[PDB]
Amino acid sequence: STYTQTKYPIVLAHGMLGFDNILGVDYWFGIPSALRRDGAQVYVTEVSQLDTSEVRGEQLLQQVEEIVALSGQPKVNLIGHSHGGPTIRYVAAVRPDLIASATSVGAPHKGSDTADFLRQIPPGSAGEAVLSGLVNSLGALISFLSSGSTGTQNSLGSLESLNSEGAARFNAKYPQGIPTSACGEGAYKVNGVSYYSWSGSSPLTNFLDPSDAFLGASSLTFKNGTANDGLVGTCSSHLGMVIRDNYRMNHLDEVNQVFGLTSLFETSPVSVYRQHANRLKNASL
Numbered sequence: 001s002t003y004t005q006t007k008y009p010i011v012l013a014h015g016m017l018g019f020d021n022i023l024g025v026d027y028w029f030g031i032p033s034a035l036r037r038d039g040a041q042v043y044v045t046e047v048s049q050l051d052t053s054e055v056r057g058e059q060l061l062q063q064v065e066e067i068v069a070l071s072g073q074p075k076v077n078l079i080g081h082s083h084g085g086p087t088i089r090y091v092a093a094v095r096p097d098l099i100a101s102a103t104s105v106g107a108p109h110k111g112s113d114t115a116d117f118l119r120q121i122p123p124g125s126a127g128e129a130v131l132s133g134l135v136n137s138l139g140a141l142i143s144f145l146s147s148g149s150t151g152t153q154n155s156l157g158s159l160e161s162l163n164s165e166g167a168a169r170f171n172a173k174y175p176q177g178i179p180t181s182a183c184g185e186g187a188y189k190v191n192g193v194s195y196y197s198w199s200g201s202s203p204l205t206n207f208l209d210p211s212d213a214f215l216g217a218s219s220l221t222f223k224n225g226t227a228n229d230g231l232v233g234t235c236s237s238h239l240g241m242v243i244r245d246n247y248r249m250n251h252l253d254e255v256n257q258v259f260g261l262t263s264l265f266e267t268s269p270v271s272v273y274r275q276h277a278n279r280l281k282n283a284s285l
């Protein structure tokens with residue numbers, strides 16, 4: 001069909017400790033295939049696993065400029081998951097002429113309580129040195145298995161961009177589509193760029209999924225019934241037009257992980273992306 005055929009190409013931007021494809025396994029499990037099936041031009045980008053939103057954004061910018069100046073398409077439709085959120089926002093804020101839309105999926109725009117929890121580790125301590133060194137090792141491994149290089153790994157920069165303080169510093173510099181209120185919506189269209197967002201509210205969805213143990217445990221860093229996906233709060237995930245911030249999905253189900261094991265009492269995450277590509281096509285993007 002033509003159901004997902006957008007005028008401008010769909011560009012997928014991964015989150016922290018993310019990748020494009022590792023030996024056949026997609027980060028966006030069954031999403032590029034399902035989008036391409038009904039007409040969408042999909043480009044899966046690879047950005048630095050662990051670094052600041054600005055560095056990651058600058059890398060994505062170069063790739064977006066390469067996609068525009070090669071495919072002969074003026075603008076592109078950006079879709080970012082988790083850290084992919086503030087990363088696509090950098091690109092949309094500095095170069096709005098090249099972006100038709102910026103959609104965030106489970107993105108901690110106003111911070112992650114899990115990242116805020118990690119601030120308990122004293123700066124410059126032994127614990128910081130070993131936590132950063134270890135996460136840097138994991139990012140280095142993900143980069144090698146995906147691209148063939150260690151890359152430059154800066155987990156302290158990821159965590160700073162993902163905590164409430166650093167996210168607020170980033171939001172001050174690039175305010176486009178960010179809600180002025182704590183949990184409302186942001187401006188739908190700023191500088192020719194349409195802003196959208198969605199997320200999930202259920203840390204536990206499928207007991208067969210190994211990641212549900214991690215996401216359920218990490219959800220406990222969110223106190224006072226703050227609705228979250230295990231790592232990101234619903235209110236924090238708001239950007240522009242909120243489709244739904246309450247899907248029965250955890251942080252990984254948002255990208256149809258692990259291996260498509262999601263809630264059966266909810267519609268497929270794949271279908272959400274397909275409906276979104278259609279919404280963008282109907283918005284003449």
Ligand SMILES: *[P@@](=O)(CCCCCCCC)OC[C@@H](COC(=O)NCCCCCCCC)OC(=O)NCCCCCCCC
Nearest residue numbers: 015016017018081082083084108112114115162231257258
């Ligand atoms: P987002 O960018 C930012 C969310 C808020 C951040 C919390 C700061 C916490 C450090 O999220 C996208 C990421 C989620 O990654 C994680 O926090 N998970 C770390 C689990 C790791 C550690 C223990 C193993 C130790 C050796 O989504 C992903 O990184 N990617 C998924 C892997 C998918 C492949 C699945 C198949 C696995 C066989």
Ligand SMILES: [Ca+2]
Nearest residue numbers: 209257258261
């Ligand atoms: Ca899952």
